[PDB]
Structure formats: C-alpha cells, structure tokens
Amino acid sequence: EKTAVVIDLGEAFTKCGFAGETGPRCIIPSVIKKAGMPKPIKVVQYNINTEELYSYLKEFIHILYFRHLLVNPRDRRVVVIESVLCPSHFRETLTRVLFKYFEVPSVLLAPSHLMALLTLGINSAMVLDCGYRESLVLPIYEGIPVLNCWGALPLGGKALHKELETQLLEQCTVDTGAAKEQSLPSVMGSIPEGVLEDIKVRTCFVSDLTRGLKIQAAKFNIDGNTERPSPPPNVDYPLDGEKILHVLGSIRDSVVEILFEQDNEEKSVATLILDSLMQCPIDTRKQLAENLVIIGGTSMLPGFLHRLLAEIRYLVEKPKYKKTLGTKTFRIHTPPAKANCVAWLGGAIFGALQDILGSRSVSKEYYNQTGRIPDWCSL
Amino acid sequence: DVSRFLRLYLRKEGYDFHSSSEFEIVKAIKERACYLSINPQKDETLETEKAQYYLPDGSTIEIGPSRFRAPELLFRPDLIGEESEGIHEVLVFAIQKSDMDLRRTLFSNIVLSGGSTLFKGFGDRLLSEVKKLAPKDVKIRISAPQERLYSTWIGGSILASLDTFKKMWVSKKEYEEDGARSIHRKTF
Amino acid sequence: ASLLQSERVLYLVQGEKKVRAPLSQLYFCRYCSELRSLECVSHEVDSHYCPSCLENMPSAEAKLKKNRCANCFDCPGCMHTLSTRATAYYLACGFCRWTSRDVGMADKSVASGGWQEPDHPHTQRMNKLIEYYQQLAQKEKVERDRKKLARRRNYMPLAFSQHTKEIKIEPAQAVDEVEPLPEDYYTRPVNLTEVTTLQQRLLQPDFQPICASQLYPRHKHLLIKRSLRCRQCEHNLSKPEFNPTSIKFKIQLVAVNYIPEVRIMSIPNLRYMKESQVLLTLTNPVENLTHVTLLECEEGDPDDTNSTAKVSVPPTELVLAGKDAAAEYDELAEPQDFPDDPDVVAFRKANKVGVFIKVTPQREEGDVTVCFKLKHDFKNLAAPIRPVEEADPGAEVSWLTQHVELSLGP
Amino acid sequence: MELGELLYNKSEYIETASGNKVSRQSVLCGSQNIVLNGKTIVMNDCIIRGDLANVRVGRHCVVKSRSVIRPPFKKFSKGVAFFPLHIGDHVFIEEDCVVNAAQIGSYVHVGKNCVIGRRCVLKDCCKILDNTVLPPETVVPPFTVFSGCPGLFSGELPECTQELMIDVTKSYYQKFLPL
Ligand SMILES: Nc1ncnc2c1ncn2[C@@H]1O[C@H](COP(=O)(O)OP(=O)(O)O)[C@@H](O)[C@H]1O
Ligand SMILES: Nc1ncnc2c1ncn2[C@@H]1O[C@H](COP(=O)(O)OP(=O)(O)O)[C@@H](O)[C@H]1O
Ligand SMILES: [Zn+2]
Ligand SMILES: [Zn+2]
Ligand SMILES: [Zn+2]
C-alpha cells in the first residue's frame, strides 16, 4: 500500500499533503486563475449549477495533485476532510470529480470535528471550528458526533473581513501621493479581499474582556461622555504601491468585537459553546466542559483563546447558564499542530491506519455500481 | 423540534437561517411545504422535483429532499439522535398500557389534535405505522376533525358555556382562604 | 502561440465532454481516429526536477525529502531561488536584499552540507499517537475479520473452540488558563516590516511564525514532468529521462502535427459584410483535404455561430515538402495550375493554400463567430506497416470531420 | 491577429548583408565582438553593446525597437569581467525589453518591457510574459512561463513550441519587407 493523500477544501484556504506527517505539505488560497478573469474565481461556491462547480473542482484538484503534490491520482487513496452539514450537491460533486475524472481508488468523507479530536488523543471533547464562512461547534463524546446538539453562527473570517471594510470606509485616511498628504476619504469604492485579510492578520488583535466590554458600551454611547479606553497607535498600510492607508487605532480592537458582541439575541462565538453544552445529555456535561478544542484560522488571531475562555466564564455567571453550567471547570486543549492545521493532522493520523481506511472508505467499484455516497441524511 | 431539524437539513441543502427572526421563516417553510411519504426509502431513491419556495425578501429556495425527510423525525426520532418513542409508538403504547377490555374501543376511537398533525399525509402514515405495531384484524379509526389547530379551544368554549363549569372553577376568595392546593385539587 | 493569437480559432473534441480548444494545445490519438484535449486525456507522473539546479531526482528519494532539493533554497520574504555568497557562507536574495544573517542563522564552514531546517516540535508526540491508533485499528480489523468469516461460514456462532501486551497513550493535559495577550501590544508602534504577511506565513505551515526573525528559509519546491494517457487509447505522448536542459519528446504527438491547421491570414471589414482570406497548411508529407461542410442546421453545438460562412469550395490537394525550398522553385500542373480557382483560392505556396470565406457579420451586435467543418485524408497506419509496406488505401480513404470555430476580431 | 502574422513595411535605411538586416537608427557600439551568423532582425533604437562581449545570435533572431542586450559582469574574486552571452536559435526579444542575461536558450519568446536580471540563464522553449522582472542569477526550465515582479513559475506552455515558434520568427522575417 501507498501513503494516502489528505485534502481539506475550504472557502479561504485548502490544506494538502500525505498521511503520517507532522503537518500539511502545501496550504494555499482556494482559487484558480482562469484566462480572461482579472480576479481568480473561488473553487468552493455553494448554490450554483453542478457543471460550473465540476469544472472549477476539476481545475483545482489538478493543481493540488501535480504543482503542489507530485504523485499519480489513480495509484493511492484519498482522505477528504469536510465539515459536518457541508451542502449535499457540493460533496456529491467533489466525490464525482475524484471517482470519474481522476479515477481515485477510494475517498473517505471524514467530519473535521471528529478528526480534530484524534490529534489530542482524548476520546471525548467539545470542538469549536471558527472558519471563514460560519463558526460551527459540535460535541464529540467517545467517537460519536452528537448532531442533536449542533450550533453555528456567521461570525467567522467573511463576517470579520466585511466588518473591517465598513469601518475603514467610515474613517478613511489615505495618502495617494497626488496632494493627498491631507486625509482623503473613499478614493477607491471597494477594497480587495486580499488586502483586508493582510490588514486583519498584521494590524488587528483581540482585546481583553475588561477592555472589550468598555469598547462595546463606548461605541454604543449609552448615556455616557467619552467612556472608551486609550487605543493603540495608528498603523500606516501601503495600498497598490503609492497609496498609503492610515489605519485608526480604534478600528484594530473594535473590528473583532462583532464576534463577542451580544447584540440582544445573546448569540456570540463565546455563547455558542454554552448554548450547545446546555442542550447536551446530563451525563456528558462535565466531561465535554473539561475537554474544549478550538480549531480554525479565525481563532489564530492574537489573544482570541484568552478572550473566549474569559467571555465563557463571564457568560456562565449570567442567570440563563447559571443554573445548569454554574459550577463547571472549563479547560482548553493545546493541539500539537497550529490552530489552522488541526483538522488536516487528524486525517493524516487516520490515513496512516491503512487497515481501517480501506474498510470505512467508499471504493470506486461501489460508486460506479450504485452512484450513492453515504451521508448522515436517510438512505 | 421538527422546525429545528428542518433548519439543519436546509443548511445541508446550503441555505443558512442563523437568526432568531430567520427561524420563523423555517417554521413558515415547514408549514407551507413538507409532505410525509408512506415509504421514506422509496422517495429518497426517486429524484425530487425541487419545489421552489418564495421568501419575504423575494429570493427563491429549492428545498428538494429536506422537504419530506424533516417531519419523518416525528415518527423516527433516533435518526437525528434523540432518545424518544415516536408519534406512532406513543399512541399504540398509551392504548397497550390501558386495560385489555378497552384496547379495541380505544383503537376504534383515536382523535388527532394540535397543529403538528396537519402535515400532508400524516393520517396516511400514522394508520400504516400503527397497524403493524397494533394486533392483526383490529379496526383502527383515526378521526381527525377539519379544525385540528383550533380543536383544543372549541372544547374549552363548549365546557365554559355549560352550567357545570360554574361549580368546577376556583373563586378568588377561595384561593385566599383555602391555600395553594385549591387550584391543584379542583383541577380534576 | 501567444504573439499570434492561437486563442481565437478553436477545434472541437468528440466523446462525453465537448471542449473548444486551440489546435496548439490539443493532441491527436493515432491508436483510434479522434483528436482529444489536455482536459479529456488522463495525466501521469514521470520525473521530478529542481527549477534552479536542474537535477533529475528519482520518485523514492522525493518521498523521503518531501518533494524538495537539499542544495537549493527559496527566500521566505519574496518567492525566488536564493544564492550562496561568501565573505564562511551566507544565503541572500537578488530581488529583495533579505539575508540569512537578518533572521540570525549562523554561517557554515562547508557550502551546502552545513545548512538544515530545524526538526518539527510535535514530531515525537506524533509517532506515539500513530502507534496507539495502529494497535487500536489492528484490533478492529481482527474483530471485523472474525465477524465477517463467521457470517461467511453461517454456523450461527457455533462454539467449536474456546473464544477470547497493551499500548496506552496518556491524553493531553488541559490548561486551566491559556497565556493572555502580552501588554506590549497595547501602547507600542507596529512595524509592518517586522510582522510577516499571510502568504509568507503559510509557506512555512509546520510552525507559521508571526515575527520575521523566527521565519526560516524553506527548501525549493521540485517541479513535475507530465505524461498524457487517454481513456480508449493506451500510451499517447511522454518525455525523456533527462528532461532537465532538453526540449526533445520521446514520442512527439500533437493535433498541429497531424490535422491540417487553419489560420486567418487576412481580416476584412466588420461593418455588416466582407470577404475573409484564411490559409489551410498541411503537416503530413502527402495527403488530401476539403472544407466543404457548412456545419449542418442546429447540429454539433452551433450555438456560438453569429454568421453564415458559405465556404462553397470543393476539395484541394495540398502536400508538404520537408526541405529548404527557393522562392517559386517549380510550377506543378495538376496540383496548382489545373484547379486555378481564382475566386475561391487566393494563393497556393508550398504547404499553403488561401481560401475566401463569405461571412455575414453584424447578425448580433458584435463579437462575430463562424462555425465550419473541415475534412482531411488521415493516413492512420493503425495496421502493422514498416516504412509504408502496406498500401494503406482504406486508411487514406477515411474522411475525418473536425468542427472548427473561428472567432473574428470584431 | 487570428494566427496570421501582419505586414510591417521597413524604410530604405537598414544594413541588409548575407540575410542579416540591422536598422541604422539602432547603435550597436562594439561591432567587432558582436556576431550575427544567421538571418537576424534588429529593430530601430535597440542596443547591443561590446563591453567585453561575444553576443552570438540565432538563425532567425528578432529584437523589437527600444530594446537592449548587454552582457553581465561576473563578481569573481580571481578577476571581475563581463561574461559573454549567447542568444540561441529562433529567439524573439519583444519591444522596449531589457536583457542583462548570460546564455539565453533557443526557441524563446521574451515579452515586452520585461527586465531580465544579471547572470540569468534561460533554457530552450520558454516564454517570459510582458511587464515581468526576472531577478539576478535565476533559471527558467523548458515549457514554462515566468511572470510577476518576483518573477516565478506561473504555469506551463503548449507542448508544440519547438515546431510552432519556427513558423512565427520565419513568417515575421518573410512578412517584414522594404516599402
Ligand atoms: N495564521 C493565521 N493567522 C491569522 N488569521 C488566519 C491565519 N490563517 C488563517 N486566518 C484567517 O482565518 C481564516 C481561516 O479559514 P480556514 O479555516 O482556513 O477556512 P475554512 O473554514 O473554509 O476551512 C482565513 O480566512 C483567514 O482570514
Ligand atoms: N397547516 C400546518 N401544516 C403543518 N404544520 C402546521 C400547520 N399549522 C401549524 N403547524 C405546526 O403546528 C404548530 C401549531 O401548534 P398548535 O396546534 O398551536 O399547538 P397547541 O395545541 O399547543 O396550541 C405550528 O407552530 C407549526 O409548527
Ligand atoms: Zn484515442
Ligand atoms: Zn535545486
Ligand atoms: Zn526574497
């Protein structure tokens, strides 16, 4: 047998490499540069025609299997990591591309949350997945994902990128280099997603709960006269060479707060753990609480894990969660690989198990015969 | 719970309804378009029409297989992973728990009430699911009224009108003197 | 290819998936009679090589070395192949002036041998987890095998004989409080030079560092030498074992090297009417062809069609002479002079014939597109023949129709 | 334009000798060391300096206007000297292009206003796109396209370059005639 390849198709970035390795070999933006198109189209797009999606995935998988990885597709197996409740037609297409065009031996559709649990070694743990599109949580108890007690909110990368763009356009101060030393607002109508992502990573950080709670009430201005903490210094960011955008200190520590803002509904990234944990079985409560896992690149943002764990323990004392989750000890697990590449590492650890892989995985001979991929929906 | 599970399957079709306001239109989608198949396995293998539903904003959504495999979780709650008996089971178990002499008459007089019986082909499925669990060659009549949603109130409206109701209710002065039990003891 | 706009006039492929591609990109399948696209054909892996120091590495060595060259390095700041400079060696880039001294890597006495990448921090924990799950997976295999052979036997679990060292990993300890964000981040100027961008962060995925001083230079990525193999046909084309510093094909096969290539020599007016002159060069030494067909009526995907090209011309026998010929060396009677065709045929040079197509532009608003079918006598040589030993009359008789789609500038 | 190469009428003033045509406008300071064996074209306002050079060009070589081919200086501890470059057979240098390259391979299409760095080797059957910067001491493999300010692998070329490029350079030469 040969070392099975692991792919993990995401909206922002795709993880790729081989099984039984310390981390992924290639990690790249999930896009393709088609002739005529100035900006490259995104390879994973939900709610489009199958033929157009088929062509994009055919183009992308080709780049992964030749330019990034150097190996024959037909020779060795595949371990496709994809999140639970991934759209039906997308997963059906992705398999149909691998089985028909590339003619792979067998694909294994592992849920990202159960794979993240294997990397630690613990059999039972709560898993939060703060991705690009949606920040999803799914309790895993001793190998069994509990779909009953699922939770998701659109407070990921996309929702954060959009919030940054909005704030920058309000307090817009750019030095074009054409008598634009004076503050010039909205010279460009929209900012490209590639720039916004680079600003987010380098400039913006996650504030402490004490400082963050003041920032929330400050921008609200709820019958108070200038009750904001002192912001960090303003950082100057180059746009397309000559144009120098002066990023305000307030924007850096306020952009993140949309994730941890209550917004009346009581629906934050913090609340989603406690909302799910309260809905879980009464016996499983204390085991899941003690074993928390924080995957996804959105949680890589500096000082996110401290704010989350703090915001949890504050929301615990709130009267809604005070009865059930009152006297619970919330402890976070530190996975071996980085927060972005926890999902991938599980699939590699699973891919190394040649004996179990072949049995669980769906063979091409079965797919060609039936034409029915197994899912958590009815058969 | 059927509205909650439909939201999950709608995300599996690729339409998110994250907001608490957006949960209300999932309840509207359920109430508008969700039919209970007599055989669930045959309808899954059959290619769906993907019937379009129109949202408040004006946008269209193709529901497809989520339409029929959402309200199925009433009759089979183990599928999602909820430890319960099921709607067909609780009806039969309630009759079987009662004395042997009454079982035949209780099967012969079943009444559907509430809004979560108005699902298209609910009576058709329940009749079939009850028959296989119930004893052979027993007459099973599931007598649904036309006003199932408003049946519970109409009953109270009739009960209230009767002169016997005058005796049944607890007066304000009675509650002050008797104590807390007054409401509980007069209930039945 | 690019200078002349090959991405204009396209040839169609037959099969499940229909594709419009330039003849330059397409390949002709000789085993059968059907040209197929780079998309349609299946791809293989032959050889790996470094783009800087062109060294053909074997497949086994690549797996050990993780598809990388040991000697060559790529800079982390910008993506370019580094160069060894002395004073006793330091690694430096030409485009950006990033040095190995900047991040604080010590200079090596030996040139290539000294340089290395640090070991992965969670490599020991990795192997322990694999071996735990490997032992645990092996138990499930034995359980699944024992269960399966019991079902195959169909003895209803008949007890003939008596039924029925452990590896235990310790699960990772959960920290009570994770390390808070350092108070430096509050009230400190952020230099965008010091912190690293996402692109250069993600190129080092094993321990993607925020600071630049931590970010080490990764080994240069090895490139691939593609070999094409079809569904119906077996072989198609391939490359030598010394693809480094070589432009030779072990088996040369391409649509331009069999099917007669069409090119628009002259472009007329685009104002509702014109007469366009197109050339039809042959590639084969001796053959015959014809551009008679008008692509039928609503058949063979003529949806792109936005004009009515007549091309009402009978077959014209053209031949290629693989030799350095002079300007009008000799005038052949039967090939050239006999079919004079002054209205139809524009000019007839060596391996060249100009043809006037009567297009009908401005049927839509703009972007004029013409569909026409081209026929050719394909000397397939499918049957066993050594230097054309067999007559190959039935092969030559075979008329292959390629649905061409020419797109005028507009 | 649509596969077919277009007409370009040259003026009377041009040095036509043994097939090799060289525009009189274009200075080539150092005529001794530079050598043009084949039927080469050098367009007006182009530079081929003899700064200790040995500039050998192809059979059907083409250099469009405002374009420079200068040899690079090798920073050697023994002796600092200008390395003699060798332009390959059937080489097409595009307009306004800068070339400080040592050993340019045969059957290559160098793009418009693209700066090739010092001591840069190019292997045969490659293509550099327009507005691109190849840094000093870089190599580009066959059947490749290098682009961007970094100057890195963008993709692969068509398989038939060796056969195709011949038609391009020879057609341009044949089509390029006096008025
Ligand atoms: N190392 C990092 N540091 C900070 N932010 C990151 C990092 N890596 C990714 N991100 C951000 O977090 C997101 C993570 O998305 P990812 O989990 O890769 O995608 P998906 O959820 O589709 O699998 C990215 O879109 C990016 O904005
Ligand atoms: N026409 C309908 N079709 C399907 N489901 C319906 C329909 N009308 C109501 N429902 C469901 O039943 C619910 C109404 O329950 P209801 O009968 O009011 O309960 P109760 O008896 O406690 O008052 C709605 O919220 C909806 O989920
Ligand atoms: Zn074939
Ligand atoms: Zn190398
Ligand atoms: Zn660099």
Side-chain angles (χ1 to χ4, degrees), chain A residues 10-13 15 130-132 157 161 197 200-201 296-298 300-301 340, chain C residues 198 201-202 208:
Chain A
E11 186 57 276
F13 302 99
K15 280 67 65 169
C130 301
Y132 179 77
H161 284 137
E197 192 170 45
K200 164 187 155 173
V201 164
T298 320
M300 199 86 80
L301 276 170
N340 206 328
Chain C
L198 195 152
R201 277 258 281 280
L202 272 289
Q208 62 210 250

Side-chain angles (χ1 to χ4, degrees), chain A residues 147-179 182-221 224 228-282:
Chain A
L147 297 191
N148 179 37
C149 309
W150 76 284
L153 291 165
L155 301 170
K158 191 195 285 282
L160 188 65
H161 284 137
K162 185 168 59 58
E163 183 62 20
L164 185 60
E165 189 176 42
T166 312
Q167 287 288 317
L168 287 166
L169 284 163
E170 291 283 9
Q171 296 89 48
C172 185
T173 54
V174 69
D175 292 8
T176 309
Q182 68 199 329
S183 43
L184 192 70
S186 65
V187 66
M188 293 295 293
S190 293
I191 308 98
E193 79 293 340
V195 165
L196 287 162
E197 192 170 45
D198 190 18
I199 291 163
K200 164 187 155 173
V201 164
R202 291 205 275 176
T203 67
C204 310
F205 61 92
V206 194
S207 56
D208 197 302
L209 177 58
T210 52
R211 300 153 207 270
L213 188 69
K214 287 191 278 281
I215 289 160
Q216 288 181 34
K219 74 192 180 74
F220 282 167
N221 202 314
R228 200 182 193 285
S230 187
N234 299 352
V235 185
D236 54 314
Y237 187 97
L239 299 179
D240 200 52
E242 288 196 59
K243 310 158 83 78
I244 313 302
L245 177 63
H246 301 286
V247 182
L248 192 70
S250 303
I251 294 165
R252 283 171 61 190
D253 56 39
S254 66
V255 65
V256 71
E257 293 294 342
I258 196 72
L259 273 54
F260 297 84
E261 179 60 55
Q262 298 298 314
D263 205 67
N264 195 233
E265 286 188 340
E266 304 173 309
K267 290 294 195 79
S268 307
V269 178
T271 57
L272 195 69
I273 291 163
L274 298 172
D275 190 44
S276 181
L277 188 70
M278 190 162 65
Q279 199 169 6
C280 294
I282 193 70

Side-chain angles (χ1 to χ4, degrees), chain A residues 46-47 82 84-89 91 134 136 146-148 150 152-154 265 267 279 375-378, chain B residues 1 4-5 7-9 11-16 18-21 40-41 44-45 50 69 76 79-82:
Chain A
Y46 308 142
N47 308 330
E82 47 81 37
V84 171
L85 54 77
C86 273
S88 295
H89 76 109
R91 183 153 76 158
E134 54 176 33
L136 196 142
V146 185
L147 297 191
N148 179 37
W150 76 284
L153 291 165
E265 286 188 340
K267 290 294 195 79
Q279 199 169 6
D375 54 354
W376 66 263
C377 313
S378 188
Chain B
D1 285 292
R4 177 177 290 94
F5 301 141
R7 184 176 66 172
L8 179 65
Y9 290 129
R11 198 177 291 270
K12 189 65 193 172
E13 289 289 304
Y15 319 104
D16 64 320
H18 57 269
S19 297
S20 57
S21 185
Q41 293 183 42
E44 195 66 54
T45 54
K50 290 211 171 191
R69 74 194 171 181
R76 221 200 296 179
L79 293 168
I80 195 74
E82 276 276 28

